[PDB]
Structure formats: C-alpha cells, structure tokens
Point group: D2
C-alpha cells in the first residue's frame, strides 16, 4: 500500500542543539583584518554558516556519543583497537552486511565472558588481506591506526622516500593520480617527487540540459590514456606508485566508477606498479556507483565498499570524513601484496630481510603513538568504529548527498554561472572564471575575495581551492593546466538543515549580482610557503 507525497519522509532528527552567535558585519571586519584575511585564522564562534571543511566537523549520532563511554583508555591494547580493526574488515573485506561480524556489539552488550572475548576479539588471527590480526599483525604489520589522513600519507611518504633514496640516489619520481589534494600533493612535492592529476578537464565543465544530468557521468574518473602516455613517456621505472582518490576531491568531489578502478588496476599491475587509494570519501563514492553505474543498483554500500577496495594494494584514509567522526585515520596495505613485494628488502633465499611494514610501524610508534591507539583517545576510537557503520546506511547517505544536490541546483536555479554539476558527494563547487565572466586574471585572486566577502557580509566561510590555494603560479605548465579554479562550499555531515542551505543560496545570489564589487586579493606574506593557503597573509584591493 502506497500513500506517496511530493516531499520525502525525513530520516533523522535533531537529538541535541547548539546556538549560533549574533555578530554584526562590523565585528567581522575587525576579525578579518586582525587575522590577516586568512580564512583559517578567522574565529569559529563569529561565524553563521561554516563551510570551510567537511573534515572532522560531523555531528555524531546519539549512538556515537553513547560509545564514548565504552572507550578504553589503557595504554597497551585498548579494547577499541581490536574493534576498530575488525570494523575495517567488516566494511572493506567481508562484503555485505550479512557477512559482518560486528564485534563492536560485544562491547556494546557489556559481554563478561572472558573466553568468548579472547576467541572472537583479542586473539583472533587474520592474514592475507588489508588488516592482519593477532600474531600476524605482529609478524607482518600492515595496518596502522593514526590520527588522520595527512599523518597516514606522511608516514607512508617518508618510508617510500627513504627506500627510494637508498636504491636510486638523486633520481626523482613521478607519482600520478586522478586528483592529488593539497595535503597529498604538498607532502609529495616536499618528498622530492612530481605529482600529476590525470582526468578529463573537458567533461568537468559541461553542464547538463536543465541543470541535472540524468545519470552521474563520473567526472572524477582517471583518464586511462593520459595515465598510460605518462607511464610510457617518463618510464615505468620512474613511476614508483599510482594513486587514486575516491571520491575526487580536487576535481570538484566528482565520483569515480567501478570500471574506472578496474582499469587503473589493470594498467598499474601491467607495469608492476602498486596502486594506492586515497579513500577519505569512500562511502559517498560507493553511493554514486550504486545510484548510477549499470548493474550496481541492488548492491549495498557495504558491498560496493568491499569491491572498490579489492582493486587497491594499499590505501590511505582520513576517517574524519566518511568515518562520520571528529578524528581518525588509517594506513593499510595488502598482506604480502604488490606494495610489500617492491618496497621490502629480501634475502637471496627469498625470505624477507627488511619488512616495509616494520619500517612503517617504527615511524608510527616513534612519531605518533603506540600502534594500539595511533594518537587517538580511546573514546574517539570507539566513536569512529560506530561512525564507519553509520556511513554504510542507505537512508543516511541518500539524505547526505541530497543536501549537496539541493545547494547546487539552488545555485543554478538562482542564476549563478559556473556551478559545477553534478554536486560532489560532500560539497558544491563554483568555477570562478565563469563566475566573474572572465574579467579577472589568474593572479587577481578574486576567488579569495569572494570567500572573504561571504565571511564579511554573511558570516559564511568557504574554501578557495583554485589558482590561489593550488599554487597555480608556483607550478609547472602541465600542472597549471590541471588546476580547477573553483571555490568550494563543504557540507558538514548531519550538522546543517534546509534553513542553512536556503540562506547560503540567497547570499551567494546576492554576492553574484554584486560581483563587480568583490575585491582582488594580494599575497603580502608567504607566497612561496608549502601549502600556503594555511599560512599566508592577504590584503584586499578593488578591481580596475
């Protein structure tokens, strides 16, 4: 029996609330100058809608809050370490809710059977996949809990550099990807390697009839020709790792398809090159696949998640995104997989001599913390495990992405030009070139003035992720052609509602209609710093 309506039934409600401050325009002018016009230095408690980053900003579910009280703060082998690892196993290896072990439920039900705990939690042995356990994790470490994504990439990048520097001193390598985001690209350039972003920058800027594609075209896909012309061009022996980002955050958070991941796997393994996933927004990407890629409409997000991860030899993850949590990170690689083969040292008789996993662990434990908590508190570790399961839920993710489509189609319906469609899984992007109608030069940095104008006028903070923040003027010509000149409106998970989005639409429309009066922005300090958009001082000036 059906009683349909032209509006959907909500699937969550506000469990607890938090008030927003009352701030004048004039007060936000004082704070802007007082902080050198750096978005990252503007006070949070002076804002009305904060869309700076979806990283760590989530509103937890009531079950996550409950779980804080189940966290274990012991220094060695706190119980959440086992629970976290087997939650990764559940979502990314087991394949389907019907296959989950959900040992988190032994902690949630206050199990007091020590024997059962031993046999199903503490002493379980796993080998052969992304997450060893028991003595196998001790003998062949391959999973590394850490505070966040950049810490996971940096522990990884350092090890790779050390090893490469020993085997090929003074040689620099090219590490391509579909989209290296500022953290990853900056940590790469800092290691000495050359990053490259291979995608179809042409499809990116097409917008569909009526404003809404009928199917999502997966604009985050890696161009497979470009990837193989790059490998044959510079030499495969010069390409030590291949990266893929899911979803593609640099390329306007656009989805990446399962067939695309299968191609990257083919090309990469063709040349014996380990393939590393950046999987911060794994669950948004799984959702786009289910909703758009033929054959995947009746598989679950948990199913698609395991399948996507079958194609990688390693991955880095900031769980502060689709962990639906406020902290967490993870680095893992296939047990005795392609990444472990190339980067370990072997004896003549075939036995391992230097395990890359041991080198990684040594760095983890000297720079971040014991492997059992990775620089997280015990309670954050339990809330993260719960949060990762929440991201598997269709109705939650359906509403999470419905919010992005609403903001983008709002920007469109209101006559804002240069709105990238469809929306990414976490954010809506605006092409600043089409926005100012090509009346500003790549060194105007007007996209930065647009962002500071949102703050000054409306208490809305966004993130310029184009020429200025991607360091257009400090890159090579090929890298310059790979820059998307876009401003980003990121949507915190579970924290905002239609009323926040309607106000942002109204305010963007107003700023559009007054775009001539948006200033340009001049760097007055830090123009050359690594990842300068976190450090540099700015100064506005009018256009001429």
């Amino acid at each position: 029996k059906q009683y349909p309506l032209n509006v959907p039934a909500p699937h969550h409600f506000t469990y607890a609330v938090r008030d927003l401050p009352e701030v004048t325009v004039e007060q936000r002018e004082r704070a802007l100058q007082a902080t050198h016009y750096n978005e990252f230095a503007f006070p949070s408690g002076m804002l009305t809608v904060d869309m700076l980053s979806d990283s760590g900003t989530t509103a937890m579910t009531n079950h996550q809050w409950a779980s804080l009280f189940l966290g274990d703060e012991a220094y060695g082998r706190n119980t959440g370490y086992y629970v976290l690892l087997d939650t990764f196993r559940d979502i990314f290896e087991r394949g389907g809710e019907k296959n989950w072990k959900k040992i988190i439920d032994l902690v949630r039900t206050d199990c007091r059977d020590v024997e059962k705990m031993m046999d199903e939690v503490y002493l379980c042995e796993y080998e052969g996949g992304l997450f060893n356990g028991g003595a196998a994790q001790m003998e062949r470490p391959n999973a590394f809990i850490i505070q966040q994504g950049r810490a996971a990439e940096s522990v990884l990048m350092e090890i790779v550099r050390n090893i490469l520097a020993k085997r090929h001193p003074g040689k620099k390598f090219t590490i391509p990807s579909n989209g290296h985001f500022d953290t990853t690209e900056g940590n790469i350039k800092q290691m000495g390697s050359i990053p490259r972003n291979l995608y179809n920058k042409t499809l990116l800027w097409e917008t569909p009839e009526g404003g809404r594609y009928e199917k999502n075209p997966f604009k985050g896909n890696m161009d497979i020709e470009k990837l193989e012309q790059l490998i044959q061009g510079v030499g495969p022996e010069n390409v030590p790792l291949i990266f893929t980002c899911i979803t593609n955050n640099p390329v306007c958070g656009q989805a990446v398809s399962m067939g695309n991941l299968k191609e990257i796997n083919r090309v990469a393994h063709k040349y014996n090159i380990p393939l590393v996933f950046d999987t911060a927004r794994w669950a948004e990407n799984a959702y786009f696949i289910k909703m758009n890629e033929e054959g995947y409409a009746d598989k679950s997000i948990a199913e698609i998640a395991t399948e996507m991860f079958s194609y990688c030899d390693a991955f880095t993850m900031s769980a502060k995104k689709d962990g639906h949590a406020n902290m967490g990170g993870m680095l893992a690689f296939r047990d005795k997989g392609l990444f472990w083969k190339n980067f370990s040292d072997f004896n003549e008789d075939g036995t391992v001599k230097t395990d890359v996993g041991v080198l990684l662990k040594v760095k983890q434990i000297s720079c971040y913390g014991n492997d059992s908590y990775g620089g997280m508190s015990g309670r954050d570790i339990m809330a993260l495990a719960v949060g990762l399961y929440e991201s598997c839920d269709f109705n939650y993710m359906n509403e999470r992405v419905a919010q992005c489509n609403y903001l983008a189609e709002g920007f469109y319906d209101a006559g804002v030009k240069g709105v990238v469609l469809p929306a990414g899984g976490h954010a809506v992007y605006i092409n600043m070139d089409e926005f100012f109608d090509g009346k500003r030069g790549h060194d105007t940095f007007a996209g930065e003035g647009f962002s500071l104008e949102l703050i000054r006028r409306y208490g809305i903070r966004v993130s310029e992720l184009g020429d200025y923040s991607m360091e257009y003027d400090l890159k090579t010509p090929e890298q310059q052609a790979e820059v998307c000149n876009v401003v980003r409106f990121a949507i915190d998970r579970s924290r905002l509602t239609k009323e926040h989005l309607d106000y942002v639409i109204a305010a963007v429309k107003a700023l559009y209609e007054d775009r001539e009066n948006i200033p340009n922005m001049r760097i007055v300090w830090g123009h050359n710093l690594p990842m300068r958009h976190f450090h540099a001082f700015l100064e506005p000036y009018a256009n001429e």
Copy 2:
C-alpha cells in the same frame, strides 16, 4: 552596515542527530490494531514525525548536556536544589537579565570557595516573594519542586480540597479559568468541583484576511465580563480560586495579553479570591506580548516574565514545556500572600496555627520525594535550570514560534479547511467541524479517525483534543459550549527542522483531499473514565 537577505539567518544547528526508522504502512496498520487504536499506546519507535505533545520531548542544548554531569545526586540539599530555586528567582522575580545572580555559574565554573558558596548559595535568606530561601523556606515553605505539572496541580488540589471539606462540608465549589486542560479540569472534576472556561469563542474562529493577523489578537484572554457574571451568579463565597493558563493551552494555545492579566488580578482581588496561574508556556506567552502588545516591544522575555508573575498569588508550572527540558515541575505561592491568608488557620491573637505551606510540603514528601529533589534526579535538576535560562533567549523563541507560524500558514496556503489562526506558541490546531464541512457528528469522532489516518499512512502522530478527548458527551451543556473540537499538531522544542514540517503539510493536504475516506471511530471500552483518551479502546467504521 547592513547586507539584507530575503531569507533569515539560522540561529542554531544540529549538535547531534538521531535516525528515524524505516516502516511500512502494513506495519503501522498492524501495530494500530495490536494497540486498540489508542494513539498513546502506539510505539514511538515506529513513528516518522511524532507530534503528540511538546511536553518533555525537547532536544536539549549541548550546554544542558554538560550540566547533567554537574548534577548532585545527594539525598539531602543537593547543590541543584539551590540553583534551581534561585533560577526561578532570576527569571520570575528579578526583572531582566541585568539583575540575574546566575549562581548556576558557580557550579559551572567549579567554584571551590566554601565560604563563598555558603554566603551566595546555601545559606541565603529570601522572603516576601514566590521563592523563600534558607530558614524562611523551612518556617514558611512556599515553593515545591516536583517532577511535573500534573503532580504540582494534584498536591495543590488535594490540600485545597481537604481545607474546603473540613471548613464547608458538602459545598460544591466552582473554579473558573480562561481554559482548563484535560489534566487540570479532570483533576478538578475528580475532586467534585465545577470547572468553567471563560473565553471569547467567537473571536477564536475568526479567520483573518489573507490568513495573517497584522497583530496577534490574544484569543486566549479571559472574558472579564463573563468572569464577573459567574462570580456574581454563583456568589463570591462559591469561588474559592481563580485559575489562568498562559498560554491558553485548551483554547488553541492562544496568547494571553498582560492587560488581561492585570484585569483578572483586579476582579479577583476585589473579592479576596487568590489567583493561580498555570504557567507551563510562560516564555511563548512573554514572546507574544513582546511582539504584539503596545509598549513592550523593547522588553526582554525575562522582564516580561517577571511582570506576568507579579499578577498572581500562586502558580503551577510543568517545566517539561517552556523549561527546554525533559522533566520538571513547580508549585509556588507568594510568601504570606492572599493564598496563604485564606487557606491557613490562625490563632486568636493572629499568629499562624496551621500553615498551608506545611500541609503541601507534607504531601510533597510523603507521595513524591524530599523537597530538595521532589522526584527528580540531580542531573535533571541542573539541566532544567540551564533550560529555563535558554527559554528567555529572544532568537531561540523567535525561531520556535516561527516553526508554528510556518506550519499553520502551510496548512492554510494548501487549502485545508479549519486551520485556527494564529498558530499557538507550541502547536497548530485544526477545527474538525470545518475540516469535514459539517458532514460528521459529535459521536462519529471523525477527529480520531483523522489523527489515526496520519499514523497509518504517514507515520505522523497527533492528538485529537476535541469532542472525544475532551469528553464533550460527558459534560454539562454549559461546558459543551466551551468544548473546542480541534486536532493538535504539537512541535517538540528544537527537535524538528523545515524538512519535517514540509512533510507534514504535504500529508495533511493529501488527507484533506481524501476527507470522505477518513473512517469514524467508536469507543468500545472506556468512555466514562477520568481523562479517558489516555486509556480508552477504539475501533474504526466507514462513514
């Protein structure tokens, strides 16, 4: 500098979230019949939008959740006892934020000066108002913490009934109000007393041009003429108390102006009749006064709240409403005021013989709990104190009532017949005589069939507060003329967003366009029970 927009800035955001269930129509229909078609017995774990009641259903603020951990669970004199009493003093006696002592901040800042805590919290003396403190509260007790409003009313009504029985055995008294609710009225008929609702039932149904009153007309006001005509018709000696509800919950949660309060106070004290306020929705009312009544536009909720309460001799409050909380109640009377003079007994020389405040305290402690917690946990007492300060915040209350305005205008702009206007401060009401175009009877109980259809089809729960749940059939002809045949959509404080509201608007519009399909309901068990909507069994037949 101003940068105007045609959309208001948001004033809060979601701190934490809870998921709603995935439920079929077949599943809800199965549960409706397993539970005899009583909406209070329907499992809330199966609802999509629950609008049964705003009482206790609030999403707390994060500062309230923090206060929980500051709660003191001791049996005698928990610190929360003092904090809560003095929070009542700040809001209802001290006249404005600038006059608040906010001793809750000594708890919040972990003050460890025993001397300072002694002088500013534990040992303070207060007398002469609604909340005695220290030795005064022991000698002349006049404030009683208790877990909710119906408990606050019951203690008062029992002690009033006992005093009236011993002094006037056999006399049946009349007690008027602008509107007594099902619990209040039911608790008064259970004494054997005659409750009466004196309001302008004609003003009530007036729909305004366009559906937007330029100013709130205060349809909750008591009819002063009708009040005098009742005091003189029954004789002052037969009116031992005068009640006044703010907002007027029974009369479509309609606003009550401050001039009205001044008048009721005058008429009452002309006859030496103590005036008791039901103040569950004080802060929504203070907002309506500020936004609509001449000369108060520049006054804060908190100022207006002190001024309202100055016109009363006692009050009962269910703090589960405008206390932004999930539990809490309060009963108080002015120290040595008119309520204490007419209900205490004195010696020949005029000193007190039997103190009515002691008679309520003995009842409080023997049936509810010690006067330092009154049936509440210690953490709930702290969270209540924080919550009552939050209800004074203009922007919070301005956005709370906006939701109700939004939902009623939604109903109107969709062409549903019977939307009372303006909306309540907590709920929107629909007149079911106007919904069905006069095509259903007072015994068809079509209002219950509507509320239950909302559940079956849409997983929306509402409260029929009309003929059935007000026992129109079990009332005197005089009282049947004051019965409002309306269904109520109550909005939980801070829990719902626009998304929830648009869904309800859509669902009601669809059911309005399917009026004839809404079955009738026939009570099959109960009917002659006090407050029978909370327990009666029901069954549907076609019209």
Copy 3:
C-alpha cells in the same frame, strides 16, 4: 579542631567500571599468543594495569562536562584559544590570583560577542612561551599536537635539518638529566648522541626506615658532569640541553628549583638553549613545594610559573600531569635564545627564516591544522580543564601519597631493591638488588618479573631496565647511566587503596619466589629502534 590519625578523603568515585574475571591459564594462553610482549597483552584481561600513567587518567566530572563544550570547527575552534590561555595562566602568570580563566566564559555560555573578541579571539600576547593573535601568526612559537613524542619529534626534526644544512657530517651531543626511551630513541634516530647526567650513587641510597626526611631531589642533573662534557666535547658541539621534570628515566625522581637555576646558568654560560620536558611538571612542583626551603607557602601554580621561567623552550606530553587522555604541546620563548640560534637572519638584522614557521609547516602538513594539531575539539576542552585540576594541592597530595604508600608497602613487606623515595607517578624496583646479584645483564630477568606479574596476578608493569633501555645496544658510557628497574606506574585518579594492597601482596609473594622467575630471550627484533614496543620474547629457566 578534632584531629584523627586517618586523613579525610578529598574525592570520591563519580562513576565505576567493572574489571574482568580471568584465570591464570587464560592469561598464560594470551601471553604465548602475543609473543610475550607486555604491550601486546590485551588490556581487557588485566586486573591492575600499571604499564603507563600516560593518557590512562580517570577524568573529573567537570572534564566530562567539558566534552560537550568542545568545538569541532576546522578553523580556530574556540578550544584553541582557551587551551593557549590556560598555558599562559599556569606557566606564565604566576599564581591563581592572576589567572584569567577564559575557560569560564565558555563554561558560562557567554553570548556577548564583543566581549569574546576582546577577551578571547583577538587578544594579543607576545614576549613569552605562548604568543596570541597576529603575533602567533607572525612569530609562531606555540604548537598544539596530540602527544609528547609528536612534540619532540617535530622539534628534533627541525633541528636536524638546520644542524645539517649548516654543519654537514657533524654528529652532536645532547645532554639531559634523563632522556626517556621516547626522547632517546628519537634523538638517536636523528643521528645525535643522547647522554644522561645524574648521580647514580645517590639514587640507590636508602634512608634508615625507608622514609627520607626531605626529598633528596635525586633526579637533579649533575652540575659537575654537565660542564665536564661541555668542555670535553666542546660548546659548539652541544646544540641543545634537555631537562626532564620529574626525571622519568631516573626513577621519576624530583628535581629542585635550585638545580633548574644552575642548569640555566651553565647553559647560557655557553649560549646553549635550555629545553624542558615537562610531562610531569605538577608533581615536580609539588615535590618542590613540600621539600625545598621557603617554598612551603608557594602553591603549585606559582612554582609552575617559576620553574618555567628557567627554560627557553619546552616539550610536554599533557597526557600525564594534564589529567587527560590525549594532548601535547611544543613551545619556545618569543625572540628568545632558541629562536636566535636556530633562525636565519638578514644582514639588516631582520629574521630571514623563522624557526617558528618551519615548525608550523611540519605541524600543519604531518599532524593537523595548528588550531587543533591532531586533537579533537572535545579533547582540547577537557585537557584545558585537566591542567587546572593538577594545580590543586589536595588532588596532587593524594596522588603522590599513593606512590609513597606503594613503595613503603613494598619496603614494609621485605621486598629488596625498592628505590626511594617514590616518584610522583610510579614506584621503581632495582632488579639487581631484587635478584641479589644472581642474574646477569643478558638474562632479562626483570622482563621475566613483569611477565610473571601478568601471568599469576593480572598485574601489568613495565620493564625500564637493561632490556627496554637497550643496554647491549649502547656505548659503555651510555651503558653506565642505564637504570635496571621495573616500574609500577599509577594511573591518575583511577585506583584506590584496595588496588595497591593487592599489588603489594602480589609482589611480596613473587619476591619470595624470585628463584622461580624465568629469564627472557629475545627471539626477534633485538636491534629495532625502541625495541621494547616491537620485540618477541620466550621464557627460559635460570641456571
């Protein structure tokens, strides 16, 4: 007054957690299944876990209340300002009388935005350890980070890059009163040479009765040895001088203020920046206040500001004396000695490369934004509350009393090798005096002691002797500073006398059976950096 021999209690249990019911055989199985690595043993199976006091604290109710005030914004969450200014209060403002406690504005829910800009967001501070506002942007000298090893690792990395693009090849020496295995491991992995300069003869001294009259401050750095090594190796080859308070390597032993002053003078004598590791500052301050002359009237907070005046830079693991489960901090004096030696300047004289900026680029690219530095927003708030709790004399006086009670319980029970007096966080036993000379350095019998505590009694402790400090992997000079002790670290606020009585009895029994404690053989990872977190062991009987 009415004295009693029994002290009065100064805290109680706010909430409880149950412990597991486990058998010897279950524990023996888990030990074999986890290679006999004490860090791989499941905490879920333990009765009393004394592996580490770091991050294992039971928070106060006010800290738990704190968690709900944490701000999870990416850019400049409010907790960033509150935490910085808590460091200013405790470590720069010289006593409670001069604190600002801006955390109280958060805890009382300040909604006056101008007040918040002028007292929190836009404050300017320069000239000390914690710049604020544009100063902290222009000359960054404070860095929030998840824990101490991340702090020292960001220092030591930046120093290494400088000392190499300046003195290529050269290998420098970094003295300290006692570098911990974390600091030493990181120094050694940087290429430099750690060295710990203290009086090992004093350390083993016993007081007649097992109770000293005044703490002899055996963690003090040997003033003579320091100038001998600086003159020996040459000033230009000592780039930094560390100092640990309390001295964790040297049995968590207290360090006097006089000694900090002396180390200050010798260090500027040759223009060497002085760098304090202050993980356990509060207990060191408490040892000063009770033992040095003319400090008995000074409170913890005054002594903490004073101690900190003598450093040019500090690293801190707030997971210890911050009464918290996560948190670290790196800081240095604004335009101070450390900033002068390690920045690069123009001929004009302006800074050319600010060492502060280099540290910030590292922090931001490898840990997290400087506004949260890899911490969640609620852990920032709770850390700020916890640092204030560590200044309270009654807390810190019951905390250290649990160590005295444990060491003196061992002594009273005939156990031999108990270092004295107890440290501020733990009790240390010398394994040589324990086994009465009858075990060799290569026997690792201390690790057999620790593992046997697990097997029979569910007690986990840590070996910090010739196995974990890597005796056989060090120069002989380094080998003589190695302390052969097993540590009993006492979690802050988590345990009670009942737990200690049981560890006391369990150690007495296992001392009386020390003839039967196995020796430990490293089967794998004998050479790994910080091998006690990695290595595999196997038990073997003693011959």
Copy 4:
C-alpha cells in the same frame, strides 16, 4: 480478586488495575514513563542487571 468488583455472571465490573492506572496517569505521569525521563528509564534497566 479481593480488590476488584465483580459482576453476577463472573466477569470484572471494576478492575483494581484500572483504578491504579487512573491515579498513576492523573497524578504522576503517563504509564509509558511514570514521571521518569526517558534516559533515567534506560539507565535504570541497565542498573538492575548490574545488581
């Protein structure tokens, strides 16, 4: 049996349970929570197992 009233044929006329429920609901709270907060209910349920 003792405190309810019964009809001639044998069936209940005045059920004592119903009388107790009317008093519960008019003086303390709905039977669903009886004057307790929702969270106090759940923590009580956990508490009783613990005992």
